[PDB]
Subunit: 287 residues, 2 copies
């Protein structure tokens, strides 16, 4: 595989691992309450802190994906959990990506740290629950009866993550209004993930081909569930944020927001997975 | 904590993450069979492959420590598993160390990859069992009844690892006979671990102080068990190596080697932990 081989070759060359209070820390249009009348009841100070929390939550989701889904899948790959993989080159490519992911986690932790320092406020990760994708991944894991099912669940969710993260990062990478340290952090992350998507795509194709029919089917079901979870707005995390901020009538509004917005995707660009499933000739079966 | 703070400050500056067939790939004196009469029954080719396997095994032990012990402890630290820690600076220091460890894992995987390429042989990690420290860590975990016990077990083993790894790396870092890519890989790793030892020491001191008396005691017992395991020769891994190479009479000799050498430490420099336990004024109680 020449894709794998060259990524391995030039990693040392491309890998990323080598303030204006006026600017919002985040995009208003990615806050669920921004689309509800309650937004007008809020003070400029509260609006500002909700933007800060938004950024913090976006960082937390990214860290949680890397630590609970992506890296655990990479480790299972290296440990031989899946048929159709193996060989020294893949091991090196994956070992490199694990470094990248850990560095991405650091970048996002620092993104939040800078916000906390500059705004002079805690915005603690401890306030936030498990992100929506983390939750759904864990629910699927808990329904597994066999080890092979858990490992395929994680692969499916990680494939979705690695192939769709570019579109999640795109949401802030291009935004010229928000804090530039925030956009630049997201852009830099975005660079690495282009190459990760290629690796993850290749690996998925090969595992799928080498799996028996029952296990193939189980894997695609996990890919489906993962994408659904990945692209959704995290209503639950935002509910934790607005409760902690003491927004009056947050609960009633939250119910109304789930009703009105339960159907919109935060991430609308699904071209990564669409294209992967097309190249695999399995797009036939989907939700 | 100024130690923590400056390590955080200058990480971007110090972090490492930014062939002669004639030369042995490893040190003969770290092969258990080197000290037994069977060594004279072996061909130069077999002696050479055992040196290669030695290096490969040493890389595998290092990877297994990073992936099963060190990074899992760092993640528990960040997730608030232990009293007496917390705060943004520690989180950044630890997030940085996790990048380092993952990079060390890559360096050691590449160390083995180069050996496999240049010697034109598989020396597969799949032949090697769990390393001795990995085994003992896992045995202690399996005896735990409560979550808090598992997290303290991992902390204790990780503290030992982070504070003692310099002495394990020293064994090859200075060796001017072995392959220079091998020595240089180990030296480069060694650079980072000086700073890791400081972090890990600080964290241990503070957790211990904040723990109740029963939990303090449990933690030190785990430190003790960890050091014992960490410094021992891995007789079991070497047994897998010599069996796979088809050394005649390996089994009888292996028994004799455990008898004669069961008492020697591969790692004789225990100054890291000795000094930590002295500064904590708990050296009183030991094995
Ligand atoms: Fe990433
Ligand atoms: Fe990635
Ligand atoms: Fe290390
Ligand atoms: Fe370390």
């Amino acid at each position: 595989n020449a894709v794998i081989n060259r990524l391995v070759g030039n990693w040392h060359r491309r890998a990323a691992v080598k303030f204006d209070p006026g600017r919002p820390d985040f995009r208003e249009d990615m806050i669920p309450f921004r689309g509800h009348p309650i937004w007008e009841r809020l003070s400029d100070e509260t609006r500002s802190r909700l933007l800060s929390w938004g950024w913090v939550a976006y960082n937390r989701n990214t860290v949680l994906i890397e630590q609970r889904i992506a890296n655990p899948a990479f480790e299972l790959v290296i440990g031989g959990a899946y048929p159709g993989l193996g060989g020294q080159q893949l091991e090196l490519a994956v070992a490199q990506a694990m470094v990248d992911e850990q560095y991405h986690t650091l970048m996002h932790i620092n993104g939040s740290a800078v916000t906390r320092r500059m705004r002079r406020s805690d915005f603690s990760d401890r306030v936030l629950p498990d992100s929506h994708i983390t939750t759904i991944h864990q629910e699927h894991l808990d329904r597994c009866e066999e080890p092979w099912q858990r490992s395929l669940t994680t692969l499916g969710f990680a494939t979705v993550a690695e192939i769709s993260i570019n579109a999640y990062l795109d949401l802030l990478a291009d935004d010229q209004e928000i804090q530039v340290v925030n956009s630049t952090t997201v852009k830099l992350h975005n660079r690495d993930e282009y190459c990760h998507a290629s690796i993850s795509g290749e690996m998925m194709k090969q595992v799928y081909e080498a799996l028996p029919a029952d296990r193939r089917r189980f894997l695609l079901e996990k890919v489906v569930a993962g994408l659904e979870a990945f692209v959704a707005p995290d209503f639950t995390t935002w509910e934790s944020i607005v409760a902690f901020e003491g927004v009056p009538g947050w609960e009633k509004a939250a119910a109304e927001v789930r009703e009105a917005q339960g159907g919109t995707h935060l991430v609308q660009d699904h071209s990564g997975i669409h294209t992967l499933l097309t190249e695999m000739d399995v797009l036939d079966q989907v939700e």
